Nucleic acid binder design. Structure first.
Lengths: 131, 100, 154, 77, 104, 50
RNA sequence: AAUGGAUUAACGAGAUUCCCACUGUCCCUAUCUA
RNA sequence: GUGAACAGCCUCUAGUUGAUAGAAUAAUGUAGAUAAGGGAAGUCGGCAAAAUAGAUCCGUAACUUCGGGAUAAGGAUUGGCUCUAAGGGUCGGGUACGAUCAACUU
RNA sequence: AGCUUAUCACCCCGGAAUUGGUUUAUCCGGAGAUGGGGUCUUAUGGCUGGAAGAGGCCAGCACCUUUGCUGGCUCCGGUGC
RNA sequence: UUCAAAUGAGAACUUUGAAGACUGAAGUGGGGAAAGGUUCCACGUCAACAGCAGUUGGACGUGGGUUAGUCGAUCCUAAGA
């Protein structure tokens, strides 16, 4: 419709999205896969130096030091604090599947929550020790 | 009232382009100013006497120069070129009589 | 009733431009009889032609915007569009910093704080670097005078 | 114009037979903190220039106006 | 050092016409005069007295004739007495009031 | 040109006095075949060449 | 071969070919303003 | 005032408010724009338009007359508000300081 | 117009290695530096005379009027790539 | 570009007031050199001219107006005559 919004938000130039990124942090196995990708020729940092929050490859290990100390990367940390807004939140707002909704909110409060925060604590423990 | 006093002041000011006229050099008429104190609840008979005095001062005596020449006008009017007497309009100085 | 003659003429009398004089529309028969600057002096001071004081060009935003600039606001990378050298040249910084390091040594040598021989070593090392600022030099004077004492005591 | 310090030198100038007019000017000025005291200025018109004389006192100013010659046309303010 | 200055106001000409009263005017100063910030923070730095045509202000504080004209044009606007009352200096630090030109 | 010579100013004076319409009493003379001023000059129209 | 030839950094409103980025040139036309 | 700036945009003093006007809003024009999906398949030819653009930090190839190439290429960043830290001047010391005052720079 | 104000250059005393002085820019000194004391150029500033009597900003009265009249105040600092 | 009033036989165009905008001080501002020669200003006034209009005008008719011992010219020499 506009000029600026078409340039960044076409179907071709779509980023990953906020839904999958919360799944990648939520367990300890998918974190170790993305921190240790096999090196690929068709990827900007040759398949290393990948930030998990912002689905984005960096060129150099220097470009992670300057990326984490920025207001752009402190969006996505503050963005991924809570429940990740699935389809189930929108259905519960109309009076439809509360018990499917409230049980998932019960699990993010109990189980999935402190497993995520004990993963994001270890990323700052690791990305400061190597950089 | 607090909105009408704002909505009245929008047409009045127009400060961005030129000016507000100074009230010290402008003059009020009795006119609009006598109606304003009535809406505040002040009396006018204290101020009415000052108008009664000065309007007794200004009125006309009709001196003698305004007597004959109230309707009478154009005492010995000028010429076609509008010139003075000692101005010598060089076209019409040849023929003195106006029929020529 | 053409009044351009008195419009121009009253601007010459009061001493303001023609956009500022004000002829009342009510007394338009009295102004037309005035055809001389002697009449326009009389027509001003009795209350027919006035001055129309200055259109306001306030600076209350400028005094407010510049007030925040004293505190260190509006000074991130987004508000900068010229280089460091255009905003503050590298020679202007040097002239300030090096004339500090001269006239401190001028007033230590004349106060007896330091002898004339050790003045002439700190004078030329001030010309090159290894004295970053004023505080960074006074510590080196103390290290010099204590080690001059240290050589003298042994 | 010239400024004269002396009073004795000034009385040479009202008798020089070139000077025809003079004037006497009274000012109201201030000292350091003090009082508003009056200050006089005697002026004499020569041919080439205008000689003036500053007296801060009002007592000596009262005396010197008598000391002017009567033939000299003296103006007040 | 802190030598006070006497500021005098003559309110006679709209007092006698009845459009103005000094009584609410004298109270209007004493709470609205600001000393170093807040209103009513004055303690014995100003004094306000009125007479019926004379309003007298004595201040040892930072209080200037420009600010004394600032408060009275507030008070002549609240009572809607602007367009018809102006505040005029007669001598140094001595003030009075008047009307405008009512005349036709 | 505002810094003109007197040789130049002496010819503007003749050009000003020739800048007039025909007198109204020459209309009336006997055997007048002269009707209008024909060497009349305007400044906007025709330059007079110094 | 100073009728001058080979070479070559820098520079060019000089002449030609391609690759990424990009896009109504195009598939294919639609619409808004003066 | 913004800014590196006598750039561009906005205002005060001063100056103009002149250039034939009214009513309707078809085509084709002239000037200026935005387009889903694909991305030079258009065309003699990427003509034209789009994209890039200021500044700070990192980084920078063949080639060579060693001066250049170079802003090479390629990346991270840029608001607002509340703060911290660094960078000064003039004074009083017998033959180490303290007061006081003031600027926009990172 | 009167008094006063200077970077440079000059003069006298003095005789310097523990080379010193000094500009943002390294130039000078036994052909006499630093340092103590002096002389001139008056670019330019300061005070005063010119000169508040002028000019500026206001207030109060007068008055078809020629238009006048009478009072005030005209003060003191700050900073700069 | 707009509303009211004035003037006039007649007003989108003239004058004053009200209001809306622009040039935005490398101006649509204030002064000149070259060149023009009265265009400057007033009074009167609209047949022609201002590619519409006109009561307005750089138009038409009659006049008014440029004040120097110090600013220029005059004097000096340049390339050259």
């Amino acid at each position: 419709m506009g000029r600026y919004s078409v340039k960044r938000y076409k179907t071709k130039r779509r980023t990953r999205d906020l839904d999958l990124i919360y799944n990648d942090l939520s367990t300890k196995e998918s974190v170790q896969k993305l921190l240790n990708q096999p090196l690929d020729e068709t990827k900007p940092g040759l398949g290393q130096h990948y930030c998990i929050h912002c689905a984005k490859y960096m060129e150099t290990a220097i470009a992670l030091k300057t990326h984490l100390k920025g207001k752009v990367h402190k969006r996505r940390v503050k963005e991924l604090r809570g429940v990740p807004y699935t389809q189930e939140v929108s259905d519960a707002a109309a009076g439809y599947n509360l018990n499917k909704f409230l049980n998932r909110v019960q699990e993010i409060t109990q189980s999935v929550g402190p497993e995520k925060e004990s993963n994001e604590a270890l990323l700052k423990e690791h990305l400061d020790s190597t950089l | 009232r607090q909105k009408t006093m704002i909505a009245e002041a929008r047409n009045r000011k127009s400060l961005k382009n030129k000016a507000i006229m100074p009230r010290s050099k402008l003059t009020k008429s009795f006119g609009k100013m006598e109606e304003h104190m009535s809406t505040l609840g002040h009396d006018m008979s204290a101020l009415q006497d000052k108008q009664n005095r000065a309007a007794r001062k200004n009125r006309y005596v009709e001196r003698g120069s305004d007597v004959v020449f109230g309707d009478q006008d154009a005492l010995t009017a000028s010429t076609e070129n509008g010139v003075k007497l000692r101005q010598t309009d060089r076209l019409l100085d040849g023929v003195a009589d106006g029929s020529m | 009733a053409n009044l351009r003659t008195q419009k121009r003429l009253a601007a010459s009398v009061v001493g303001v431009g023609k956009r500022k004089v004000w002829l009342d529309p009510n007394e338009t028969s009295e102004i037309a009889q005035a055809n001389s600057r002697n009449a326009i002096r009389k027509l001003v001071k009795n209350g027919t032609i006035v001055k129309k004081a200055v259109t306001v060009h306030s600076k209350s935003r400028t005094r407010a915007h510049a007030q925040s600039k004293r505190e260190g606001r509006h000074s991130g990378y987004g508000k900068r569009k010229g280089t460091r050298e255009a905003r503050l040249p590298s020679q202007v910084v040097w002239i300030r910093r090096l004339r500090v390091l001269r006239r401190l040594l001028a007033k230590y040598r004349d106060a007896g704080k330091i002898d004339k021989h050790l003045y002439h070593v700190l004078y030329k090392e001030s010309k090159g670097n290894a004295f970053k600022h004023k505080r960074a030099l006074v510590e080196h004077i103390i290290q010099a005078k204590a080690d001059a004492q240290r050589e003298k005591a042994l | 114009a010239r400024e004269i310090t002396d009073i004795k030198q000034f009385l040479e100038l009202t008798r020089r037979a070139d000077v025809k007019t003079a004037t006497v000017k009274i000012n109201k000025k201030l000292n350091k903190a003090g009082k508003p005291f009056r200050q006089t200025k005697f002026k004499v018109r020569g041919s080439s220039s205008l000689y003036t004389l500053v007296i801060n006192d009002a007592g000596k100013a009262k005396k010197l106006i008598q000391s002017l010659p009567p033939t000299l046309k003296v103006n007040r303010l | 050092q802190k030598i006070a200055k006497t500021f005098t106001v003559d309110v006679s000409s709209p007092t006698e016409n009845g459009v103005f009263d000094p009584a609410s005017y004298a109270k209007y100063l004493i709470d609205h005069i600001k000393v170093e910030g807040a209103v009513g923070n004055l303690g014995n730095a100003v004094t306000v007295t009125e007479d019926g045509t004379v309003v007298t202000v004595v201040s040892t504080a930072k209080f200037s004739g420009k600010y004394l004209k600032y408060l009275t044009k507030k008070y002549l606007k609240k009572n809607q007495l602007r367009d018809w009352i102006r505040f005029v200096s007669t001598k140094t630090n001595e003030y009075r009031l008047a009307f405008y030109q009512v005349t036709p | 040109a505002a810094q003109k010579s007197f040789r130049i100013k002496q010819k503007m004076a003749k050009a000003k006095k020739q800048n007039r319409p025909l007198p109204q009493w020459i209309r009336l003379r006997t055997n007048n075949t002269i009707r209008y001023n024909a060497k009349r000059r305007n400044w906007r129209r025709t330059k007079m060449n110094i």
